[model samples]
Target: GLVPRGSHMEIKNGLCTQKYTKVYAEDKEKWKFNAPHHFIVGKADCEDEYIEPIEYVNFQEGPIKEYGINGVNNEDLILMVITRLQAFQDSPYKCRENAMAITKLQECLMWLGKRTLDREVKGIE
Candidate 1:
């Protein structure tokens, strides 16, 4: 089911003190939609928790690597990024402010690697 709300156009404008600016109607219409539009002005400070260091583990001689299953390699970097992004997309806490998101993402990557290794081993046997 879908719900409808009031039809109101919300516009966000920023101006320098010394200059005059005008927003075109087409630009406004292009940005308008059936959603709440609120502009967050000013610098928003976020907690220092979401930043994480990338980990690279070499398993060239290990059983896992021997079976052609390595941890998310460089080629899969995008997948990892997307996974982490989606994890914090709707989080109540900011991704950059929350430390749990980074920890959780690491855990997810580790689990994914382990699962891949396990599946590779099973397939070989």
Candidate 2:
């Protein structure tokens, strides 16, 4: 009920993005571990290439609404942030950059996650 069919996530000029439609995959179980992520593939210069590009990800359900945690980019970024933070959570040599990532990553995910929940969280870098 989200992305349609023939959707895919890719990167152009070193930027990650996605494009999707509400396509029902015959193998939906493949996406069991999948989650909304990244950003607007269409806005991220979405393009249709019958030959395809160096795609890194893809989706379905008519390209999820670009206004919440469901957005591909947001979900992707948040997942990454969460993972990176968790990966380094036990580092004994925590550095300033690590701390910075913790705060910034949480804030960013907060806004994205909350937005999907119909909350407000923005106005920052």
Candidate 3:
């Protein structure tokens, strides 16, 4: 990030940045960030293959659907639960107490959904 993005040079002493003959040339040598959107992309690449970029890219598209989803509050809570459920990549779930906390939230959401749906159904009558 310190280095400019989308900058370029011809290979010299051995690399593209090998031509950055300005101040802090040493730091320029350690430059780690790289070309945009270029990756090895080695894959069998089934419909499932690009699921990864699909994931991070989804992070950018969010709350996006201009159309309505049923209950707004209900959707937020539901997504929070879904994210909490899937967020086990960093470490193990804090099983005992954390599990109980999540369990409690799930229970709470269960009631919330039930009541919201119940109200909608009653209004339909």
Candidate 4:
């Protein structure tokens, strides 16, 4: 998380580049060609009670019978894992938090689908 108080120190001394990207994806063609990406950051504090539910979910067990979920696509599986993480953080499905997470998930799905479509469209398969 860019260690506390490090941002200002790095900026003043031009040392921050060592820790964080001054300009990310400098050589990545995707970042250069596509629209700018969006990022969000927030901080939260919670007790043990909030964490227990997340641990109960056993997020690592993918496509398991216990979850009663199967045949899910790769993107949906990723969403499930992330949802489990959010549950662990006691993040509620409400307000801006819910909207932002959903938006991010949609963005991921769109990117995944687009890549697949591009491959097929270009006859890469």
Compared with the true structure, all predictions reach lDDT values of 0.40, 0.46, 0.39, 0.41
Candidate 1 per-residue C-alpha lDDT over 1-78 given as tens digits, one digit per residue, 9 for 90 to 100: 111212322223554331322111122343333322222122112122221212223322235545566433432653
Compute the lDDT of residue 125 as modeled in candidate 1. 32
Q: Give the TM-score of candidate 4.
A: 0.32
Q: Residue 13 lDDT in model 2?
A: 42
Instruction: List runs of model 3 lying over 4 Å from the truth.
Output: 1-78
Question: Candidate 4 lDDT (Cα, whole model)?
Answer: 0.41
**How much lDDT does candidate 2 score?**
0.46
Worst 10 residues of 4 by lDDT: 48-57
Query: Runs in model 2 with CA error above 4 Å?
Result: 1-55, 59-73, 119-125
Better of 2 and 4 by TM-score: 2
In candidate 3, where is summed lDDT lowest over 10 consecutive residues?
51-60
- What's the residue-level lDDT of 123 in candidate 2? 48
Judged by whole-model lDDT over C-alpha atoms, candidate 1 comes out at: 0.40
Write model 3 residue lDDT over 1-125, tens digit each, in one string: 02232232212344334222311111234333332211111112323212112111011122326533422344464667756765753357535665566677777788877877888888951
Give one clash count per candidate, in the order shown: 0, 30, 0, 0
lDDT of 4 by residue, 15-77 (tens): 443232222211123232253221112122322122111111112223245655423356756
Off by over 4 Å in 1: 1-96
